[PDB]
Symmetry: T
Subunit: 143 residues, 12 copies
């Protein structure tokens, strides 16, 4: 079910919104500004994805999650409790989560295709393009 994949992705997006703020506040090193600026763009991206997933769910006739409690229950992202990082650590953690998201949107696209949902396919494939481009760039940060 497309709804099931979307609702779980909606949970991840808000959970990641929070996580990336952690990285945003707590990066250490001469690198501070680059990471601080980049993590800002990323968390704005997740606020964006959060809203879009929710409205797609609503467009499909279902209820999006409306509480952080639901978010915590349905998320597959483990929350980060550390409060200090260097650039390398942050890039590694974001990469891991993006790889997770990439698999999920791959499934989203395949599932929506089977159910004949052209709109959700299109949304998934667009997100996939963004995640794969970022994944490539992230891997280069760590080489």
């Amino acid at each position: 079910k497309t709804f099931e994949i979307l609702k779980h992705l909606q949970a991840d997006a808000i959970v990641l919104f929070m996580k990336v703020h952690n990285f945003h506040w707590n990066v250490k090193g001469t690198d501070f500004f680059n990471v601080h600026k980049a993590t800002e763009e990323i968390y704005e991206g997740f606020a964006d994805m959060f809203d879009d997933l929710a409205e797609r769910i609503a467009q499909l006739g279902h209820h999006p999650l409306v509480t952080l409690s639901e978010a915590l229950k349905l998320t597959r992202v483990k929350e980060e409790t550390k409060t200090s990082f260097h650039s390398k650590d942050i890039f590694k953690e974001i990469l891991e989560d993006y790889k997770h998201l990439e698999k999920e949107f791959k499934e989203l696209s395949n599932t929506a295709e089977k159910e004949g949902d052209k709109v959700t396919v299109t949304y998934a494939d667009d997100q996939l393009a963004k995640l794969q481009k970022s994944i490539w760039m992230l891997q280069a940060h760590l080489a």
Copy 2:
């Protein structure tokens, strides 16, 4: 302690970020666009307040909350589980929460003053101006 008030306000801001999205997606009535547009501005405001409170905490030498789990634990805002509202309902709920926030920033300002924290006073009083202006306008929606 100023830190204690900030950390609790940081929790409310993210919790309200979520709540206002609920209102944003689930408003019903010929009023849809006005509320949908206004709730968008409001939740962007809370993402803003969330970040600013967190960075003020960090500036004070302490750790801001970095998980939705901490947010849920420390918040004083009850999460909204309903998924359908008319404009009147949304405005009433936002008003209630703003009144709560207004009392908290009033305390923030008084507490930071006692501790000689001029910067946090200034931030609190600015937030207070915003909340009191909105409260007035919100009350007018309901009259």
Copy 3:
């Protein structure tokens, strides 16, 4: 005399500048923002008309009114002492005043024509276009 019509219109414009602020501050209902935004545009329009009429008077070799005392003496607009309205009330009151202004600019145009004042005719007819377009829209608010 064209000067006589302008000087009385100048008085109305400032009096209406004030009146529309009343509507702007004191509108009640879920409608608040629409009316609050619209009344803002309207009172800026009257500040505009106020200045333009005054400078046209000056261009004609006469003295524009320079006091709120003169404004009160020369105005044909009754000031609104109520401090609470719903959208319907505000739209009705603005309509009444616009109809008054429309008759005055109709006279302005006819009088300036007789006196061979092409510039004041042009200004009057432009104001007339604006007032007639607004009048139509205002009437639709009330149907």
Copy 4:
């Protein structure tokens, strides 16, 4: 045939361009501005869709319709002869037509897929995303 679906959609787009202007001019109620502004955006959207469909037809080697006479002949949208509406009526009528358009673009996408026309599929699915998002919002206006 993809051409057949496009040519009929081109007819609807111009017919709806006209219909939405009717709603735009003839809305009644304190709601006037919201609807007047929204219907403006919608009819600009249809002028847009009109042109794009026509040029896609031309790209496919065929002739787009070039007369209002052809438009009337090929349209599936019944023209609105009433000249007075409240917001609720307008939203209901637009919804009905959007549901019709949504089915047509669903067919467009399926048909173009069978004929191996990747470009028309992409255009259809994009239009579908727009129509489904609007349909959801429209339904919320009426609840």
Copy 5:
């Protein structure tokens, strides 16, 4: 009657909106872009004139036409069924129609003057300035 002239002009404007799109899609020659760009500006101009005429009619207390069926019935512009043109042909056809429109707005201005309708005179004379400037330029294209 001013209303009669406006209602017929409203019909022409939408009919020309359509015609100019034909020219826009179907121009041939190394000239393609110049004509394609210029016809785009022109048809946007007619969408504009269409709306303005309709709202002027409404301001006068009457009903604007609200159907392509009425448009076809009331228009004086013959629809173009050819689907291939060179720049010279397009400029000739637009000129012919502009000359027609120019005579109509000349009448509009004279008629509205007799009926003491200063606003419609002003609108007509403005349109006349635009049409006469374009007519001059169009004639130069063909010399």
Copy 6:
């Protein structure tokens, strides 16, 4: 009482809005444009202060003044009946009024502090910064 100081300041702001227009229209000398431009900025500033004071009053639960009649009754600014000035005269008159306003906002800040009104203090101190900067510059015009 903070309300009492605000209501009197609201009266001055509209009275000064009018006065500065007088200076704006009636400045004489090769200096015309500088003064004409500067007085424009100043009267826009007072329209601004007028609205802000009124809304602060409303936020405090009271009614702002809504008539030019109330304005005249409550103002401490004497209206200017002269209709001709050189730059030096205008700068002297504005200075006198700014000094008056400066004392009033000084009181506003002190009074709001005693009543624990942090928001009105903040507004007063901001206005004070603006008035003191202008006062300095104004004095330099006259040296």
Copy 7:
């Protein structure tokens, strides 16, 4: 004849374009920048009027003047041979010429009216509004 008035006005506009440059380069006094900036705007205004008059002539089926030789022959403006001025001198000279232009556009409007040329009337009356506003301001510079 409207053509005769336009052709003479076209000559004045280019002659004044040149004259105002003289004032622009050769102003003396602490006033330099104000006059230098203002004369720049004025000469751009005359380049504008020059072109518009020429194209109106062309729209009327006649030939605009195309040489500085024709300009000199047909102008009523005496060229300024002095190369040094104070602000007062420049404002006096511009005023004199504007008064001349004002009479000419007054005639233009009357003549075009008799010949039933609504477009040239409209252009003349607009220019008249600009000249009368400037004349008023210019006179104030010299008082």
Copy 8:
């Protein structure tokens, strides 16, 4: 293999970047500016496609070509050695190359589909939309 199609397309894009500059510098005829402006947009388009193809290759885990030597080896576009053209010649040559590119992106889309590469499909179909729209317009230049 999707990689094989991309690497060959990357070669064409840089080769065409160069070719279109030739057309850009060496167009002859009264047409110069139109072609010069259009070829500028086109070569910027190919710099764009060049980079995007390269980064897609990198995202797929392979190495994009990094030398003009590789470009020459892998390209299917014959380089243009003539240094003089009229508009007709340039449009014919660009059309031929666009038709080649269109077939290649058609293959790209089909191949990426078989390999389950949703992102490359999406990129190919978008490029296809652009190429087919341009092809249509190009053909019209030559009719």
Copy 9:
């Protein structure tokens, strides 16, 4: 003498300002807009060069020409009395004049160098770059 070359160039610039307007108004052919737009840019360029040359003369301690009479006396450009052209004719005439200007700025640069005037050299060489780029493009229009 550098002054002598500048004063003659100043005369040409205003004379060409006029000439290019002729081309601007009187171009014939399907080419109208391209030439009309291009000649507009060119005459604005000459207004620019006119002013800059004049101010350079003034900077050198001399008087720039301040009359169209001086312009006619000192110019080397023959005025164009024809009032009808095709694109080819206009481009030929502009080329001829640009070649003249190019030789003059070549001399300007050489002369200013001998007199050790680094500023005038720099201005001349910049103008030369512009003229040589345009000359090349102009020649291509005519091939």
Copy 10:
């Protein structure tokens, strides 16, 4: 005395303006651009603070320092004579100076409060917010 604190802060601001330029020109490392860009923003900040402090002093009725000689005499910042740094060194040096400035503005605020200078308090507290936010970020660069 508030004046004494301001005059010493004014000296530091210009001295730091200079120092930060040193860092701006002389940073070494792959880090060059980040530091070069950041130091640019910082020195513009000090030019800003320099001017604002000076004008506040003037507003208080005293003379700001007007010479680099006075600046050197009154500054508490030691000038940096080294001409080569890595990012770490620059961030350490800026931090040290910001900590100094932070203590000074803390004193400024306390002193102005005692003297009842609400405007200088407000300015100091704003500067304090900026310095404390930067200090936090600077410390993170060095961890």
Copy 11:
């Protein structure tokens, strides 16, 4: 040596940065705003020249001055200790300093030419153009 001229010019630029601020704060007269605005532009110009000279020195392989102490030692500009001026005084003082700078950049250009430093010549000649244009305008302020 080019380095010697640059290092002395770098000192003057910062010294003038300071001096022009003095004029900026301490101008007296109805002229205040014109001078205050103009001196702001000028001191921003010197901050600009300061940085550019320093970076040119660095590009030449040498160390720019990095202290106000070096600036004072190497400057040829006498610092202004007066704290009160009328427009005439300020313009006279700036002129004197610009004449000094003009001679220095004249030398800079000649010296860099002898040493075959094309880049420094180009920079000097550009500065020279700016200084000579300003000098002319400044002289006109004082006539």
Copy 12:
């Protein structure tokens, strides 16, 4: 011969356009974004230089190179076949090439001077300023 130097520089510019893309795609390290952004600006700079050199050649009456084959034949830049770099490597390689370009533009300027080509001198010296500024900054990256 100036033509010979330009034609070889044109070859280098396109070859470097390609090389810098390699660096752009294949940078490794936490530094990724800084280098990726900077290399983007650089390759756009070379596309720019490529076009400008080509058009200068054309302005000189000769044919610019129009093939990558000619580019390879005439270039002095060795192509980079490695596909992995850290920031340090990229900056070293760009520096080496910039030093080469700097010598070439030094020659360009000297050669064009001998041939009396003021325009090419000016272009060369401008490029030289850019290259020398970048060279300085590049060297600082590596220290």
